[PDB]
Design an enzyme around this catalytic site. Structure first.
Site, mmCIF file in Angstrom:
data_model
loop_
_atom_site.group_PDB
_atom_site.id
_atom_site.type_symbol
_atom_site.label_atom_id
_atom_site.label_comp_id
_atom_site.label_asym_id
_atom_site.label_seq_id
_atom_site.Cartn_x
_atom_site.Cartn_y
_atom_site.Cartn_z
ATOM 1 N N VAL A 7 -4.712 -22.341 3.811
ATOM 2 C CA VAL A 7 -5.661 -21.329 3.363
ATOM 3 C C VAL A 7 -5.552 -20.115 4.274
ATOM 4 N N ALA A 9 -5.983 -15.502 4.358
ATOM 5 C CA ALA A 9 -6.195 -14.178 3.784
ATOM 6 C C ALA A 9 -5.324 -13.166 4.514
ATOM 7 N N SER A 76 -4.469 -26.733 26.546
ATOM 8 C CA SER A 76 -5.388 -26.614 27.673
ATOM 9 C C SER A 76 -6.748 -27.251 27.396
ATOM 10 N N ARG A 241 12.067 8.706 -35.588
ATOM 11 C CA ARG A 241 12.223 10.152 -35.712
ATOM 12 C C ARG A 241 13.166 10.730 -34.659
ATOM 13 N N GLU A 278 -4.301 15.401 -17.648
ATOM 14 C CA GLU A 278 -4.148 15.357 -19.096
ATOM 15 C C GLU A 278 -5.475 14.982 -19.748
ATOM 16 N N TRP A 300 3.953 16.896 -21.567
ATOM 17 C CA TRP A 300 3.937 17.532 -22.880
ATOM 18 C C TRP A 300 4.938 18.681 -22.967
ATOM 19 N N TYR A 326 -5.101 16.283 -29.452
ATOM 20 C CA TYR A 326 -6.285 15.610 -29.000
ATOM 21 C C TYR A 326 -7.091 16.588 -28.196
ATOM 22 N N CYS A 386 -1.323 9.249 -31.250
ATOM 23 C CA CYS A 386 -0.837 7.904 -30.978
ATOM 24 C C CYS A 386 -2.013 7.003 -30.632
ATOM 25 N N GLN A 406 -4.075 2.089 -30.991
ATOM 26 C CA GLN A 406 -2.900 2.918 -30.788
ATOM 27 C C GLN A 406 -1.835 2.594 -31.832
ATOM 28 N N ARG A 407 -1.546 3.558 -32.701
ATOM 29 C CA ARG A 407 -0.599 3.351 -33.794
ATOM 30 C C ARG A 407 0.823 3.129 -33.291
ATOM 31 N N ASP A 410 4.733 3.619 -26.539
ATOM 32 C CA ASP A 410 5.913 3.619 -25.688
ATOM 33 C C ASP A 410 5.608 2.788 -24.450
ATOM 34 N N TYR A 450 12.070 1.784 -26.167
ATOM 35 C CA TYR A 450 13.263 2.584 -26.426
ATOM 36 C C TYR A 450 14.483 1.961 -25.750
HETATM 37 N N1 LIG Z 1 -7.198 -13.997 7.726
HETATM 38 C C1 LIG Z 1 -6.787 -15.346 8.006
HETATM 39 O O1 LIG Z 1 -6.398 -16.061 7.070
HETATM 40 C C2 LIG Z 1 -6.816 -15.916 9.417
HETATM 41 C C3 LIG Z 1 -6.661 -15.051 10.513
HETATM 42 N N2 LIG Z 1 -6.681 -15.515 11.775
HETATM 43 C C4 LIG Z 1 -6.518 -14.578 12.848
HETATM 44 O O2 LIG Z 1 -5.495 -14.953 13.706
HETATM 45 C C5 LIG Z 1 -5.811 -14.361 14.962
HETATM 46 C C6 LIG Z 1 -5.287 -15.181 16.043
HETATM 47 O O3 LIG Z 1 -4.285 -16.108 15.726
HETATM 48 P P1 LIG Z 1 -3.044 -16.343 16.739
HETATM 49 O O4 LIG Z 1 -2.860 -15.102 17.619
HETATM 50 O O5 LIG Z 1 -1.782 -16.593 15.942
HETATM 51 O O6 LIG Z 1 -3.347 -17.603 17.653
HETATM 52 P P2 LIG Z 1 -3.599 -19.023 16.987
HETATM 53 O O7 LIG Z 1 -4.573 -18.875 15.852
HETATM 54 O O8 LIG Z 1 -2.290 -19.577 16.459
HETATM 55 O O9 LIG Z 1 -4.176 -19.983 18.031
HETATM 56 C C7 LIG Z 1 -3.617 -20.023 19.316
HETATM 57 C C8 LIG Z 1 -3.698 -21.300 20.043
HETATM 58 O O10 LIG Z 1 -2.863 -22.260 19.440
HETATM 59 C C9 LIG Z 1 -2.454 -23.139 20.469
HETATM 60 N N3 LIG Z 1 -1.122 -23.572 20.222
HETATM 61 C C10 LIG Z 1 -0.230 -22.965 19.403
HETATM 62 N N4 LIG Z 1 0.928 -23.654 19.415
HETATM 63 C C11 LIG Z 1 0.782 -24.731 20.259
HETATM 64 C C12 LIG Z 1 1.625 -25.793 20.676
HETATM 65 N N5 LIG Z 1 3.013 -25.885 20.156
HETATM 66 N N6 LIG Z 1 1.164 -26.730 21.552
HETATM 67 C C13 LIG Z 1 -0.109 -26.638 22.023
HETATM 68 N N7 LIG Z 1 -0.938 -25.654 21.658
HETATM 69 C C14 LIG Z 1 -0.517 -24.677 20.769
HETATM 70 C C15 LIG Z 1 -2.510 -22.389 21.716
HETATM 71 O O11 LIG Z 1 -3.204 -23.129 22.680
HETATM 72 P P3 LIG Z 1 -2.798 -23.080 24.188
HETATM 73 O O12 LIG Z 1 -2.796 -21.616 24.670
HETATM 74 O O13 LIG Z 1 -3.777 -23.853 24.977
HETATM 75 O O14 LIG Z 1 -1.438 -23.666 24.389
HETATM 76 C C16 LIG Z 1 -3.211 -21.159 21.417
HETATM 77 O O15 LIG Z 1 -4.271 -20.979 22.289
HETATM 78 C C17 LIG Z 1 -7.277 -14.287 15.021
HETATM 79 O O16 LIG Z 1 -7.672 -13.020 15.440
HETATM 80 C C18 LIG Z 1 -7.737 -14.522 13.687
HETATM 81 O O17 LIG Z 1 -8.571 -13.482 13.281
HETATM 82 C C19 LIG Z 1 -6.852 -16.848 12.031
HETATM 83 C C20 LIG Z 1 -7.009 -17.742 10.974
HETATM 84 C C21 LIG Z 1 -6.994 -17.295 9.645
HETATM 85 N N1 LIG Z 2 8.619 9.247 -27.333
HETATM 86 C C1 LIG Z 2 7.469 9.663 -26.595
HETATM 87 N N2 LIG Z 2 6.871 8.790 -25.597
HETATM 88 C C2 LIG Z 2 5.749 9.214 -24.888
HETATM 89 O O1 LIG Z 2 5.185 8.389 -23.944
HETATM 90 C C3 LIG Z 2 5.192 10.507 -25.151
HETATM 91 C C4 LIG Z 2 4.088 11.245 -24.639
HETATM 92 C C5 LIG Z 2 3.153 10.779 -23.573
HETATM 93 C C6 LIG Z 2 3.888 10.702 -22.275
HETATM 94 C C7 LIG Z 2 3.530 9.743 -21.343
HETATM 95 C C8 LIG Z 2 4.217 9.679 -20.137
HETATM 96 C C9 LIG Z 2 5.252 10.571 -19.880
HETATM 97 C C10 LIG Z 2 5.979 10.486 -18.581
HETATM 98 O O2 LIG Z 2 6.955 11.189 -18.373
HETATM 99 N N3 LIG Z 2 5.518 9.570 -17.585
HETATM 100 C C11 LIG Z 2 6.187 9.447 -16.330
HETATM 101 C C12 LIG Z 2 6.314 10.650 -15.460
HETATM 102 C C13 LIG Z 2 5.084 11.283 -14.904
HETATM 103 C C14 LIG Z 2 5.203 12.526 -14.090
HETATM 104 O O3 LIG Z 2 6.020 12.568 -13.133
HETATM 105 O O4 LIG Z 2 4.487 13.530 -14.361
HETATM 106 C C15 LIG Z 2 6.337 8.090 -15.725
HETATM 107 O O5 LIG Z 2 5.379 7.575 -15.088
HETATM 108 O O6 LIG Z 2 7.419 7.460 -15.853
HETATM 109 C C16 LIG Z 2 5.608 11.530 -20.815
HETATM 110 C C17 LIG Z 2 4.917 11.595 -22.016
HETATM 111 C C18 LIG Z 2 4.008 12.474 -25.268
HETATM 112 N N4 LIG Z 2 5.056 12.531 -26.185
HETATM 113 C C19 LIG Z 2 5.779 11.321 -26.109
HETATM 114 N N5 LIG Z 2 6.888 10.921 -26.819
HETATM 115 N N1 LIG Z 3 -8.978 -16.692 2.533
HETATM 116 C C1 LIG Z 3 -9.203 -17.002 3.910
HETATM 117 N N2 LIG Z 3 -10.182 -16.260 4.691
HETATM 118 C C2 LIG Z 3 -10.383 -16.581 6.033
HETATM 119 O O1 LIG Z 3 -11.306 -15.885 6.777
HETATM 120 C C3 LIG Z 3 -9.626 -17.636 6.633
HETATM 121 C C4 LIG Z 3 -9.575 -18.213 7.931
HETATM 122 C C5 LIG Z 3 -10.409 -17.778 9.091
HETATM 123 C C6 LIG Z 3 -11.840 -18.125 8.841
HETATM 124 C C7 LIG Z 3 -12.173 -19.417 8.467
HETATM 125 C C8 LIG Z 3 -13.504 -19.738 8.236
HETATM 126 C C9 LIG Z 3 -14.480 -18.760 8.383
HETATM 127 C C10 LIG Z 3 -15.910 -19.103 8.136
HETATM 128 O O2 LIG Z 3 -16.762 -18.800 8.957
HETATM 129 N N3 LIG Z 3 -16.284 -19.786 6.937
HETATM 130 C C11 LIG Z 3 -17.656 -20.114 6.699
HETATM 131 C C12 LIG Z 3 -18.658 -19.020 6.556
HETATM 132 C C13 LIG Z 3 -19.818 -19.202 5.637
HETATM 133 C C14 LIG Z 3 -20.004 -18.262 4.495
HETATM 134 O O3 LIG Z 3 -19.847 -17.025 4.666
HETATM 135 O O4 LIG Z 3 -20.319 -18.706 3.359
HETATM 136 C C15 LIG Z 3 -18.016 -21.498 6.276
HETATM 137 O O5 LIG Z 3 -17.114 -22.302 5.920
HETATM 138 O O6 LIG Z 3 -19.220 -21.862 6.274
HETATM 139 C C16 LIG Z 3 -14.141 -17.468 8.758
HETATM 140 C C17 LIG Z 3 -12.811 -17.151 8.989
HETATM 141 C C18 LIG Z 3 -8.640 -19.232 7.960
HETATM 142 N N4 LIG Z 3 -8.089 -19.313 6.682
HETATM 143 C C19 LIG Z 3 -8.698 -18.331 5.870
HETATM 144 N N5 LIG Z 3 -8.484 -18.029 4.543
HETATM 145 O O1 LIG Z 4 -0.071 8.727 -25.535
HETATM 146 C C1 LIG Z 4 1.010 8.514 -26.051
HETATM 147 N N1 LIG Z 4 1.563 7.287 -25.993
HETATM 148 C C2 LIG Z 4 2.760 7.035 -26.560
HETATM 149 O O2 LIG Z 4 3.192 5.901 -26.458
HETATM 150 N N2 LIG Z 4 3.437 8.017 -27.211
HETATM 151 C C3 LIG Z 4 4.750 7.836 -27.860
HETATM 152 C C4 LIG Z 4 4.759 6.706 -28.913
HETATM 153 C C5 LIG Z 4 5.844 7.153 -29.914
HETATM 154 O O3 LIG Z 4 7.034 6.380 -29.757
HETATM 155 C C6 LIG Z 4 6.135 8.625 -29.553
HETATM 156 C C7 LIG Z 4 6.122 9.492 -30.815
HETATM 157 O O4 LIG Z 4 5.091 9.064 -31.708
HETATM 158 P P1 LIG Z 4 5.768 8.699 -33.124
HETATM 159 O O5 LIG Z 4 5.819 7.228 -33.290
HETATM 160 O O6 LIG Z 4 4.892 9.332 -34.318
HETATM 161 O O7 LIG Z 4 7.261 9.293 -33.186
HETATM 162 O O8 LIG Z 4 5.097 9.018 -28.622
HETATM 163 C C8 LIG Z 4 2.899 9.278 -27.283
HETATM 164 C C9 LIG Z 4 1.704 9.547 -26.723
HETATM 165 F F1 LIG Z 4 1.175 10.791 -26.802
#
Ligand SMILES: NC(=O)C1=CN([C@@H]2O[C@H](COP(=O)(O)OP(=O)(O)OC[C@H]3O[C@@H](n4cnc5c(N)ncnc54)[C@H](OP(=O)(O)O)[C@@H]3O)[C@@H](O)[C@H]2O)C=CC1
Ligand SMILES: Nc1nc(O)c2c(Cc3ccc(C(=O)N[C@@H](CCC(=O)O)C(=O)O)cc3)c[nH]c2n1
Ligand SMILES: Nc1nc(O)c2c(Cc3ccc(C(=O)N[C@@H](CCC(=O)O)C(=O)O)cc3)c[nH]c2n1
Ligand SMILES: O=c1[nH]c(=O)n([C@H]2C[C@H](O)[C@@H](COP(=O)(O)O)O2)cc1F
Ligand SMILES: NC(=O)C1=CN([C@@H]2O[C@H](COP(=O)(O)OP(=O)(O)OC[C@H]3O[C@@H](n4cnc5c(N)ncnc54)[C@H](OP(=O)(O)O)[C@@H]3O)[C@@H](O)[C@H]2O)C=CC1
Ligand SMILES: Nc1nc(O)c2c(Cc3ccc(C(=O)N[C@@H](CCC(=O)O)C(=O)O)cc3)c[nH]c2n1
Ligand SMILES: Nc1nc(O)c2c(Cc3ccc(C(=O)N[C@@H](CCC(=O)O)C(=O)O)cc3)c[nH]c2n1
Ligand SMILES: O=c1[nH]c(=O)n([C@H]2C[C@H](O)[C@@H](COP(=O)(O)O)O2)cc1F
Lengths: 505, 505
Positions: A7, A9, A76, A241, A278, A300, A326, A386, A406-407, A410, A450
């Protein structure tokens, strides 16, 4: 044999998990997810063992977790026989004695510690991985999560959730009846295209985005990617077309959540600014393409050029006058269009205004409709609508949902732009009418790809999706046409590199 | 232990299987289905045993089936040791020696014979049942298939197929990973309505039509019934323009096949004649409700009455003048409406005509669209368009598919009528433009159930669906408005009894 799950995040891109002995974020839903995923068990007489590093054990304040047995790895720390809920082992391998002994343990969770994660993966002790991807990367990390080996495969990817404007996703990585299937296959052999099931064949693995995720495709970018796969599979190669032929299917849909995220694709860097510009260009009812070009938005351009206009029988038209397109139908429906320079104020039917007024004065109305399809004006338009017609819904908990038909779609260019555009529009209408964003459902008629976008989209399908970004407005406006690009804040958008694709004029 | 399945083709209602020593039908697809489903095996060194009655053995001309071993049940037939592919046993129980001996048999199929079926069920020897329902009942039978005991449950129901205008279906009756589910449930506990998955909860068994069929819900009436269950589950109780409140959900869809069947509901007897009459009433562009009432169709009575008209601010209107309602927008878009008596010939935009002409002159066009939503005429209409906009698609194999967007849907009254109406319309447009019917996709905005239809629809959900009927035209017309009710032939429609439900005015 006992199940050992990881588990963790981590950040979406660098996979950072900690900074300065603590977490680089504060997400209550994530900690709760941890608590629940670690408290999950069948036998009431058994408990779950939680293995963590010494520094992680320090991170939680050296206090035990209820209904669980914390296993601290340290060289430790002493074997503190006092607390029966906490136990210390010298090494990770010896720590996994929960298998051979102590049948009071039902499940084992590798719970922390980069030093622990890395050698829990290196020595292959982990069966499952619960990864919580978090959408931040412009911060500082000192502790990372090791890269997942190829022995694991994703089987689940939840929808994007939001907490304090932070996007995040939940994923599961796993280390990896016949009768109905046989019957359906046989019927598919007997009947050919007659059987509708054979007309909608399931996409092959070669064109299926992240094939390992079968039953856990919860992320809503899959609503688009699986559509891409479906068109790529069952697409009938047909002409249009333009000189560029498309692979086309008919009758599709995509669903999207806007409550906890913003449906902006991450598999490709989408020009959000152009989309917004737009959108407000539509809202103002402007038909002048130059106004869009002046702000460096060239979507456009091709459908505005003098050659294209003269080709479609609009040679009398100015260089970028798109006609009653439009916005003009939104603000001035059935209004006699002259040029892009004329002042069409007060003329026609203002659908948008009446839409807002009806949305706030009568939310439970079953008519909130904005259309752009005007048969009388189709001949004058540079390009028929469209995204034809949209309908809006106000839910009981004051959320605003949007449906769009949407008729023609693309899937390479138009689709993402449409999704994001109507998402932003839904959010605007939500803020102006005093609601919150809800869901976005897009129903597609001619879903096509296309033939010059093939390699590009096949490249896009090779990218595992990332959590959707967040969209927040910096100020509340009085009029919906007063929105500016500076008022838009896009939070947590870390997409894959852009993919260049040409528009078929 | 070895699997014993029953393969049988029976009529939909009376479950007849034979007449005068032969089959009451001739379906090549069915016999082929038999041949396949009986030839299905894993081991190449093994064969499948087919058990059948003496009379059935006479029915096949007493000739063996290839790659299979026919087991004949007879008290008179001598134990022929000549043919190694045919064997005779004195009784059914002794006949099942394939289980204790002869490991050359992989599967056992109880293949025929009411006298065989009945005591194969009575003595409980059957594990699986392959039932091929056939849609004809107005004929004569002498051999029936025994009623399936409660120990069996349906797990599959294929889509309705058509051969020689005969509807049929294939069903399977059976004698009866956790991690992702747990994760999703936990996320559903943490996040509430925030998680979109919890907003679209899977329908409970109590309101799920035929709950036993989980993965084999192939029949397309399930596209409607499961929607009914979804509204019945997640429906937000909300008010509306009428005094009757509805349970409503937003953004849905239903798919339908029209190639091998006709999407007319069988769980409730639907008045097809009224649907058709309303459809051609639309096609003619007629807005006079009396013309519909004169033909004993009263679906537009409530929305036409003088009280309702005066209530919605149309007191100046005649007793049944609906106004510029559908058809008028199909044939005369943007036409200034006066009364229902005026002759609106040549005025407005004829969308339907241009639609047909475009359909036959340019099939691969992406603008095939018929709309009814006219903001300028909404105030004059007795009721704004529910089935708002439709788009049509000619496939590469010359099939006509139809998509329809519906802003508001009465799942009790309006829905089936809309499905059947646009199905028939699609077929008409197909015949007029020289194509064949394809698929029908209906995208629904406000999918709602009125609170006075609850017990009725819950009653409808208690009925296991039957195969869709067939629709054939008796003559080919030159103009689409020339269609008559006598020209329509509905074949194989055996629905459950009608369910009376009142319309909310
Ligand atoms: N968002 C998330 O899902 C989670 C995030 N975290 C984050 O991780 C951060 C810290 O994690 P991180 O820095 O990696 O440290 P760790 O969570 O991995 O814990 C460190 C401890 O692990 C022990 N340890 C590790 N390997 C060994 C080994 N081979 N033998 C014996 N002991 C070992 C060490 O003990 P020793 O020094 O005594 O040897 C060390 O103190 C926290 O700030 C926390 O917020 C933690 C859990 C979940
Ligand atoms: N055959 C056809 N397909 C279409 O999607 C249209 C439209 C609407 C439209 C929608 C998106 C774009 C477009 O270039 N999009 C891009 C570029 C965006 C940018 O850089 O501005 C992309 O994300 O890939 C251009 C036109 C207007 N006339 C169209 N004719
Ligand atoms: N998705 C996800 N989120 C995380 O924070 C972790 C962690 C680290 C961790 C693990 C447990 C907690 C914790 O206090 N959990 C609680 C909090 C209670 C609550 O808010 O409901 C609990 O189980 O009651 C806080 C941080 C270890 N793995 C994790 N995975
Ligand atoms: O918002 C839009 N979304 C879209 O998909 N088209 C594309 C769909 C179509 O392939 C092309 C031309 O329409 P027509 O099918 O009438 O040729 O414009 C145009 C827009 F303005
Ligand atoms: N659509 C479908 O799925 C199928 C339909 N059919 C139809 O069924 C019709 C006829 O079937 P049906 O009238 O029921 O007759 P059967 O198919 O059941 O076969 C009759 C024979 O079974 C033998 N038999 C039955 N019980 C016993 C017993 N306890 N001991 C010894 N022998 C037994 C009898 O032999 P004996 O007289 O020597 O004692 C009899 O001759 C056919 O016309 C055929 O078309 C058949 C198979 C499938
Ligand atoms: N769904 C279904 N249909 C049926 O006709 C039956 C029967 C009766 C039966 C059983 C077998 C046949 C038969 O001749 N099958 C063939 C025909 C070959 C072919 O048409 O492909 C075969 O296996 O080669 C004809 C009738 C017994 N069980 C049946 N179940
Ligand atoms: N609230 C509401 N719901 C509706 O479905 C409508 C319609 C369309 C419509 C659709 C079907 C009916 C209807 O009475 N159908 C029936 C009866 C058919 C008959 O006997 O003629 C049924 O099958 O139960 C009546 C009206 C028109 N106006 C409506 N208003
Ligand atoms: O074809 C139709 N289908 C349908 O479902 N309605 C219902 C939907 C709605 O609940 C009611 C009135 O529409 P409104 O929601 O605008 O009151 O008519 C009407 C039709 F004509």
């Amino acid at each position: 044999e006992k199940n050992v799950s990881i588990v963790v995040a981590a950040s979406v891109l660098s996979s950072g998990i900690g900074i300065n002995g603590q977490l680089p974020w504060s997400i209550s839903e994530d900690l709760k997810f941890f608590s629940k995923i670690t408290n999950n068990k069948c036998d009431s007489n058994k408990k779950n063992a939680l293995i963590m590093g010494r520094k992680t054990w320090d991170s939680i304040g050296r206090r035990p977790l209820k209904n669980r047995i914390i296993v601290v790895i340290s060289s430790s720390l002493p074997q503190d026989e006092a607390d029966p809920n906490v136990v210390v082992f010298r090494n990770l391998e010896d720590s996994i004695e929960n298998l051979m002994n102590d049948d009071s343990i039902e499940n084992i969770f590798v719970c922390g510690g980069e030093s622990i994660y890395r050698d829990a993966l290196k020595d292959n002790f982990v069966d499952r991985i619960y990864l919580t991807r978090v959408a931040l990367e412009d911060i500082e990390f000192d502790t990372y999560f090791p890269e997942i080996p190829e022995t694991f495969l994703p089987v689940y990817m939840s929808q994007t959730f939001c907490t304090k404007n932070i996007s995040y996703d939940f994923m599961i990585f796993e280390k990896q009846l016949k009768s109905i299937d046989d019957t359906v296959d046989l019927l598919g052999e007997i009947f050919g295209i007659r059987k509708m099931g054979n007309r909608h064949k399931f996409p092959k693995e070669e064109i299926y985005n992240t094939p390992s995720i079968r039953f856990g495709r919860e992320h809503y970018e899959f609503q688009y990617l699986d559509l891409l796969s479906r068109v790529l599979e069952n697409g009938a190669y047909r002409e249009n077309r333009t000189g560029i032929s498309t692979y086309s299917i008919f009758g599709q849909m995509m669903r999207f959540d806007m409550r906890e995220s913003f449906p902006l694709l991450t598999t490709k860097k989408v020009a959000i600014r152009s989309i917004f510009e737009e959108l407000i260009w539509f809202i103002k009812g402007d038909t002048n393409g130059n106004h869009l070009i002046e702000k460096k938005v060239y979507i456009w351009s091709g459908n505005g050029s003098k050659e294209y206009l003269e080709r479609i029988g609009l040679g009398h038209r100015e260089e970028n006058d798109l006609g009653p397109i439009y916005g003009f139908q939104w603000r001035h429906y059935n209004g006699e269009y002259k040029t892009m320079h004329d002042d069409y104020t007060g003329v026609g039917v203002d659908q948008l205004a009446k839409l807002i007024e009806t949305l706030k004065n009568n939310p439970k109305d079953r008519r909130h409709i904005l259309t752009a399809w005007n048969p009388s004006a189709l001949s004058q338009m540079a390009l028929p609508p469209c995204h034809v017609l949209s309908q809006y819904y106000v839910t009981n908990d004051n959320c605003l949902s949007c449906n769009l038909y949407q008729r023609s779609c693309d899937l390479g260019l138009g689709s993402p732009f449409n999704i994001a555009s109507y998402a932003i529009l839904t959010m605007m209408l939500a803020q102006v009418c005093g609601y919150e964003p809800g869901e976005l459902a897009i129903f597609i008629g001619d879903a096509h790809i296309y033939e010059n976008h093939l390699t590009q989209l096949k490249e896009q399908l090779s990218r595992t999706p990332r959590p959707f970004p967040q969209l927040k407005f910096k100020r509340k406006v009085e009029n919906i046409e007063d929105f500016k690009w500076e008022d838009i804040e896009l939070i947590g958008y870390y997409p894959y590199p852009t993919i260049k694709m040409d528009m078929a004029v």
